[PDB]
Design a binder for this molecule. Structure first.
Ligand SMILES: *[C@@H]1O[C@H](CO)[C@@H](O[C@@H]2O[C@H](CO)[C@@H](O[C@@H]3O[C@H](CO[C@H]4O[C@H](CO)[C@@H](O)[C@H](O)[C@@H]4O)[C@@H](O)[C@H](O[C@H]4O[C@H](CO)[C@@H](O)[C@H](O)[C@@H]4O)[C@@H]3O)[C@H](O)[C@H]2NC(C)=O)[C@H](O)[C@H]1NC(C)=O
Ligand SMILES: *[C@@H]1O[C@H](CO)[C@@H](O[C@@H]2O[C@H](CO)[C@@H](O)[C@H](O)[C@H]2NC(C)=O)[C@H](O)[C@H]1NC(C)=O
Ligand code: M6K
Ligand code: NAG
Ligand code: CA
Ligand code: CA
Ligand code: CA
Ligand code: CA
Ligand code: MN
Ligand code: MN
Ligand code: MN
Lengths: 214, 466, 216, 454
């Protein structure tokens, strides 16, 4: 099958910028390529077909180009609606194959996260479970690493992470990490820590608590 | 008493004969002043008119050539006589009429040419196998009717051009049946295979080497082949003195003139021969199919009897074309041509079962009428054609010619010929309107108003310019 | 106008079969090719196959040969995608696609049909309050919604009152069951001065529990 | 009656180009009238016949015309694991031309097409194609509704149903006043014949170069049939439009099928959904009844009348003999919803093989008496066989049975003078409608100007 290597995976840009998404095939496809758009939490809309032809209704600020095995999608002067996912698709050969995708994200100034740790609730402990929650809210850029430590030692089993899309107001990202243990195992230890590694600080942002102690 | 000859009060011998075929003119000098010179021949002699001075032509009809009808068409270098008499002299005075007869015989043991023109598209593959002995089988049965049989063979499919022809892949051009599990010949329009010959085993062995081709559309280009088989006299080999049978076999519809435009072909058919040394029709891809009227013209010109030997699924189609091409015969062909032998024999009998008179170069002022004597001495008035005849039968026609007035040219000749026959009757007509006394007229006679007139036939006529 | 209206979200068990539909709106389904595409967050987009509804002839990616069966009924102007012997990996969003002009293009897309294959029964969530530990100018509370099935759940604070400064994170599948959490930030003078409640509704089991956040 | 046969205007194309095979009047966005001329054997780039089109400005002296350029290069697209192929060699571009608004439609009925997939193929066949041009803007578009991508094996399994591979779309053509292009395809559905219709605006907006296979959703094609009466009927050999159902909002189609029902021939009137409103059957087999169709109101009652040509009709003559001369049939439309009866008038040629009725052109009102008139071509008629065009005038009861004027060919033998005709347009703006006559055998077009009646 024809492999469609689409680059970049994502880009941080601003309104009015002129950006370019590229798509490389494993062989020549002679402009038999289409470009797609998927706005957040919605279906797909066709942008380009046969390499350069605009789909009816698409603004002219979109444009496609390229030949052989290398093609490009260009957006002159980005609009607030243009921040979405973009995919290439070849139809030179069956089966049709798609590019990995490209997400246009809003660029802004860097911002450190606001960490907050939360011990297990009384209700959950009485049921036989124990979940330590660690919120990491309003940071930029999106790249972040969370590390759970039990009595200073790293813990990787039983961690459940969740990320939000770029916020509509401040264009920041947030993360929720949840370490779930049994009640019996949660009481074998005292210290519980989540470390946040972000590019806004060489030192990891640490937040922790001690069981029983408050 | 007085009659139309006298009561008309004519002025000359020429005007007297123009009154009625019964009038006569007396050119005698010793004739009373009150006695008319234009009267019945009986009345002139009654009035002491000199018998030598009486001008009274009589319409007659005498034979010049009267060869006897031949009992056999065999032998001879075509000294066979089918029409008797062959030439007569006809004399007519103004508004008169004379009658004559003509005999026509369907002579026994007359030579026959049979050119077998065969559809060789793919559905005729079984038909080729069944006629591999037709040449000898046909020779046996035709031997009972003639001792001079010649037979030939031609074949057609359709115009070798898209869309009639498959043109992809390249293999399909060399072998149109490639996408099946067989081989067939490349497509061909029309090809002459065997010139008319009396060596009937040549027919068998050529047929055994023939094979079918394959084209795309059900109508085929047989009308292209009928035209070429008709107008390529020397190549097909039609003999001058013989019955010409063109046996056209097919199981499909046929292309007609103006169909060629679906192949980008718009040039009309020129009705000329385009089969060269390679024996293929070279204008197949550049010239349109011929029209029915153009086919009819060439078939009649070359005395070709076209036989539509077609299958039951298209017998009504060709019966309807046959009515638009007079003289054409239709027979029902089996799906493998296994019955084509009897079809040809029955068609040959049907072809020679009719005599139909035809007139050529008849002058405008002459009109003819016919009475036919077919079967056993039964006269049929107002008819110039017999039917239901057998070989060796003889019919006759009584003919009467009626001239209107007197034409300018005093000598013309026309022909009475049966359709498809070689011989004919030539009628040499002479219009006797003048008087012999006019050849000895006296211009500027001193008997006519002091040289102001001309004295001819015993009367004075106004000279030229008056 | 060309619109492709697909069926609603399906919720089935492994080993069973499901048949999605794609109804043409504003045009004849017989006009063009109709493709089916599979989308997953990790694996991305994948082409299942196509059908010409004018004749029923189909093409498939050999990866889906066996599970995917594409059909069409020109009468109801609908094209179908049947999936058999369902597996957890068949949990994806499925789109029907047709071209605009180019015979081979992929221009018009339906809204998509969500499919979820699971053995989980209808389980109600367990709502837990998240209060901080025993200082600053800003305070942050939380609410943990754990062990519910199927999706979705609506989470608010003080019955939609407190809306600004809230982060409700997407649900995550934890052993055939879903887990969700939400955070909220206000000033120190607001809490525990003013009561803050976590309202969680799960219409699947028809439960609307509410937990008030209490300090430690 | 009042066409000038003394001072003609001659336009000429290249030798052997068949310049004048088809023609039409063309008005630009400013109303200036030109002559579009098809030359279906014009040489292309590879020194091979591909056809061509010429747009002749109006000049009393005539002369040479500039070319209306179209892409003549064969195309190849490797898409969908298939290979699409167009073949323009001997396509006959210009075998039909028609003008509507400021757009010219020139068609190549014998453009071939094929689709390769591994070792299989669709078969290389003449689907035909039409080229559309807006000369003032340079806009170009194409329309080839019979191109497909079904492999040959499938057609065999389904007994060649809906087989459009040999359409030859553009064999005949016409455009409704609303701008709907109607193509005759006499080879459609395995030589039954079909019609393809699509708005000109949608052809332009949906076309892109290099696609080769694209959808025109607003297009409409006629239907296949299993009735053997239609087999090999060449339905769409000729086409025309008019108003025959009394509903001015609907446009009716007139279709010639000259070999319909075992070469009896037929002409049919349909609504825009290809539903049959009337059928006129041929009088005589092989006469090619339906070779040409013309629509015009000749008797001044406001109702369109129908003229059908059967150029191969054989007239009955003395001694049970037939003479191919050709014949034209006039059908007057009755008042209100009623069937077209027998012909109101039969016009029969005189010259043997002259093909009277090969072309029929509405002239508009030539002598300005209130009745529309026609010209009938006999491309091989006249006492010399060089060709004749005969003008028949309208009257309250239809047409005059004798011609008001006869135009003898000014070209040598074989010019096919009259094979193409077009009238009803005032090219010199003198208030009288004029006549253009093609003579593709001589590669020339003759313009006859109408003058005040004498
Ligand atoms: C070869 O040539 C023959 C002769 O022309 C064709 O046969 C004719 O075909 C036409 C059309 O199919 C027939 O027309 C129909 O005639 C009927 C009345 O005919 C009666 O009288 C004849 C006398 O011989 C009888 O043979 C016959 O059986 C009948 O008893 C009408 O009833 C028909 O009217 C219906 O159809 C027409 C159109 O088809 C409609 O307009 C009418 O409203 C009505 O619905 C029709 O008029 C004709 O009768 C046939 N003649 C003969 C002698 O059979 C062949 O078709 C032709 N074949 C080929 C392959 O070319
Ligand atoms: C054809 O036969 C008719 C008989 O029906 C002939 O007409 C008669 O000919 C005789 C000849 O003696 C006349 O006496 C009759 O007056 C004719 N009767 C008519 C004309 O009604 C006719 O002469 C024959 N013609 C030829 C050329 O043989
Ligand atoms: N749209 C339709 N209803 C329709 C009408 C007519 C046909 C055919 N009419 O004829 C062809 C059959 N072909 C003819 C040539 N045959 C080979 C040969 O004779 O060489 C082989 C068989 C098929 C098909 C569909
Ligand atoms: C002309 O007719 C008469 C009257 O029947 C007949 O006696 C005579 O033989 C005919 N003449 C010829 C030459 O047949
Ligand atoms: Ca109407
Ligand atoms: Ca009228
Ligand atoms: Ca007039
Ligand atoms: Ca004028
Ligand atoms: Mn055949
Ligand atoms: Mn057979
Ligand atoms: Mn054929």
């Amino acid at each position: 099958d024809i492999l469609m290597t689409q680059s970049p995976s994502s880009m941080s840009v601003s309104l009015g910028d002129t950006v370019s998404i590229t798509c490389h095939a494993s062989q020549g496809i002679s402009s038999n390529i289409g470009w797609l758009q998927q706005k957040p939490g919605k279906s797909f809309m066709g942008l380009i077909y046969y390499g350069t032809n605009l789909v009816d209704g698409v603004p002219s600020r979109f444009s496609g180009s390229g030949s052989g095995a290398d093609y490009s999608l260009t957006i002159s002067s980005l609009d607030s609606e243009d921040f979405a996912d973009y995919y290439c698709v070849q139809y030179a050969q069956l089966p049709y194959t798609f590019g990995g995708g490209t997400k246009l994200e809003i660029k802004r100034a860097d911002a450190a996260p606001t960490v907050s740790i939360f011990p297990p609730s009384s209700e959950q402990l009485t049921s036989g479970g124990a979940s330590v929650v660690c919120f990491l809210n309003n940071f930029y850029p999106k790249d972040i690493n969370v590390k759970w430590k039990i009595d200073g030692s790293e813990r990787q089993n039983g961690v459940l992470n969740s990320w939000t899309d770029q916020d509509s107001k401040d264009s920041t990202y947030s993360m929720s990490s949840t370490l779930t243990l049994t009640k019996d195992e949660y009481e074998r230890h005292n210290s519980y820590t989540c470390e946040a590694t972000h590019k806004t600080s060489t030192s990891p942002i640490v937040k922790s608590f001690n069981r029983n102690e408050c | 008493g007085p009659n139309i000859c006298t009561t008309r009060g004519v002025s000359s011998c020429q005007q007297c004969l123009a009154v009625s075929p019964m009038c006569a003119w007396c050119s005698d000098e010793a004739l009373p002043l009150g006695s008319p010179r234009c009267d019945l021949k009986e009345n002139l002699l009654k009035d002491n008119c000199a018998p030598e001075s009486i001008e009274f032509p009589v319409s007659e009809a005498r034979v010049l050539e009267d060869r006897p009808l031949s009992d056999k068409g065999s032998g001879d270098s075509s000294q066979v006589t089918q029409v008797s008499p062959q030439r007569i002299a006809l004399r007519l005075r103004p508004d008169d009429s004379k009658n004559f007869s003509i005999q026509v015989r369907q002579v026994e043991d007359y030579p026959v040419d049979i050119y077998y023109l065969m559809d060789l598209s793919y559905s005729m593959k079984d038909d080729l196998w069944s006629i591999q002995n037709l040449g000898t089988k046909l020779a046996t049965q035709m031997r009972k009717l003639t001792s001079n049989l010649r037979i030939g063979f031609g074949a057609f499919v359709d115009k070798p051009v898209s869309p009639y022809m498959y043109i992809s892949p390249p293999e399909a051009l060399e072998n149109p049946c490639y996408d099946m599990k067989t081989t067939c010949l490349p497509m061909f329009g029309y090809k002459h295979v065997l010139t008319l010959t009396d060596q009937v085993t040549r027919f068998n062995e050529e047929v055994k080497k023939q094979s079918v081709s394959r084209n795309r559309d059900a109508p085929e280009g047989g009308f292209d082949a009928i035209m070429q088989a008709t107008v390529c006299d020397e190549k097909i080999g039609w003999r001058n003195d013989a019955s010409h049978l063109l046996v056209f076999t097919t199981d499909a519809k046929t292309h007609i003139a103006l169909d060629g435009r679906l192949a980008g072909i718009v040039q009309p058919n020129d009705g000329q021969c385009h089969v060269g040394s390679d024996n293929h029709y070279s204008a197949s891809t550049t010239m349109d199919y011929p029209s029915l009227g153009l086919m009819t013209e060439k078939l009649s010109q070359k005395n070709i009897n076209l036989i539509f030997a077609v299958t039951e699924n298209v017998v009504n189609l060709y019966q309807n074309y046959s009515e638009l091409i007079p003289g054409t015969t239709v027979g029902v062909l089996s799906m493998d041509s296994s019955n084509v032998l009897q079809l040809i024999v029955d068609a040959y009998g049907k072809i020679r079962s009719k005599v139909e008179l035809e007139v050529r170069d008849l002058p405008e002022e002459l009109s003819l009428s016919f009475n036919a004597t077919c079967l056993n001495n039964e006269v049929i008035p107002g008819l110039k054609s017999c039917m239901g005849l057998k070989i060796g039968d003889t019919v006759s026609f009584s003919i009467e010619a009626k001239v209107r007035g007197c034409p300018q040219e005093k000598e013309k000749s026309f022909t009475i010929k049966p359709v498809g026959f070689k011989d004919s009757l030539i009628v040499q007509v002479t219009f006797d309107c003048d008087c012999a006394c006019q050849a000895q007229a006296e211009p500027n006679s001193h008997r006519c108003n002091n040289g102001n007139g001309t004295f001819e036939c015993g009367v004075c006529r106004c000279g030229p310019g008056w | 106008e060309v619109q492709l209206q697909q069926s609603g979200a399906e919720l089935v068990k492994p080993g069973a079969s499901v048949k999605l539909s794609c109804t043409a709106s504003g045009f004849n389904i017989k006009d063009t090719y109709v493709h089916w595409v599979k989308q997953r967050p990790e694996q991305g987009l994948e082409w299942i196959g196509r059908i010409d509804p004018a004749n029923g002839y189909t093409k498939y990616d050999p990866k889906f040969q066996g599970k995917a069966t594409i059909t069409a009924d020109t009468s109801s102007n609908t094209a179908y995608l049947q999936l058999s012997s369902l597996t957890s990996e068949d949990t994806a969003v499925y789109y029907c696609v047709r071209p605009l002009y180019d015979y081979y293009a992929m221009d018009y897309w339906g809204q998509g049909t969500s499919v979820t294959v699971s053995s989980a029964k209808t389980t109600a969530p367990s709502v837990y309050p998240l209060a901080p530990v025993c200082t600053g100018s800003s305070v942050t509370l939380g609410c943990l919604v754990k062990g519910y099935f199927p999706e979705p759940v609506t989470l608010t604070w003080n019955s939609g009152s407190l809306s600004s400064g809230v982060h409700t994170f997407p649900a995550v599948l934890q052993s055939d069951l879903y887990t969700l959490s939400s955070s909220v930030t206000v000033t120190s003078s607001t809490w525990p001065s003013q009561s803050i409640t976590c309202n969680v509704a799960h219409p699947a089991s028809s439960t609307k529990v509410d937990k008030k956040i209490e300090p430690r | 009656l009042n066409l000038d046969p003394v001072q003609l205007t001659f336009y000429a194309g290249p030798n052997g180009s068949q310049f004048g095979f088809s023609l039409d009047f063309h008005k630009d966005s400013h109303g200036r009238v030109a002559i579009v001329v098809g030359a279906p054997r014009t040489l292309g780039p590879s020194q091979e016949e591909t056809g061509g089109v010429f747009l002749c400005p109006w000049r009393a002296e005539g002369g040479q015309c500039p070319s209306l350029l179209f892409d003549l290069r064969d195309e190849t697209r490797n898409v969908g694991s298939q290979t699409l192929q167009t073949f323009k060699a001997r396509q006959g571009l210009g075998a039909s031309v028609v003008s509507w608004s400021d757009v010219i439609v020139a068609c190549a009925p014998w453009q071939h097409w094929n689709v390769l997939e591994k070792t299989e193929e669709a078969e290389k066949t003449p689907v035909g194609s039409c080229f559309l041009a807006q000369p003032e803007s340079g806009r170009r578009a194409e329309y080839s509704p019979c191109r497909g991508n079904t492999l040959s094996r499938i057609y065999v399994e389904n007994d060649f149903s809906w087989d459009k591979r040999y359409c030859e779309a553009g064999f005949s053509s016409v455009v409704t006043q609303a701008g709907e292009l109607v193509l005759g395809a006499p080879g459609g559905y395995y030589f039954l014949g079909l019609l393809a219709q699509a708005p000109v605006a949608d052809i332009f907006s949906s076309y892109r170069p290099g696609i080769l296979l694209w959808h025109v959703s607003s297009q409409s094609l006629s239907f296949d049939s299993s009735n053997p009466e239609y087999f090999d009927g060449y339905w769409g050999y000729s086409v025309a439009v008019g108003e025959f159902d009394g509903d001015l909002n609907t446009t009716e189609y007139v279709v010639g099928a000259p070999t319909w029902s075992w070469t009896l021939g037929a002409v049919e009137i349909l609504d825009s959904y290809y539903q049959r409103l009337h059928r006129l059957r041929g009088e005589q087999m092989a006469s090619y009844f339906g070779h040409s169709v013309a629509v015009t109101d000749v008797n001044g009652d406001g109702r369109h009348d129908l003229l059908v040509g059967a150029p191969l009709y054989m007239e009955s003559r003395a001694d049970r003999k037939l003479a191919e001369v050709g014949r034209v049939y006039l059908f007057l439309q009755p008042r209100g919803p009623h069937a077209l009866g027998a012909p109101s008038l039969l016009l029969t040629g005189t010259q043997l093989y002259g093909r009277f009725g090969s072309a029929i052109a509405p002239l508009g009102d030539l002598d300005r008496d209130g009745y529309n008139d026609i010209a009938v071509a006999a491309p091989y008629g006249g006492p010399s066989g060089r060709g004749q065009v005969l003008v028949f005038l309208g009257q309250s009861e239809g047409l005059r049975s004798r011609p008001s004027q006869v135009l003898d060919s000014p070209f040598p033998t074989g010019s096919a003078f009259g094979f193409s005709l077009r009238g009803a347009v005032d090219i010199d703006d003198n208030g009288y409608p004029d006549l253009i006559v093609g003579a593709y055998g001589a590669n020339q077009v003759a313009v006859y100007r109408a003058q005040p009646v004498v």
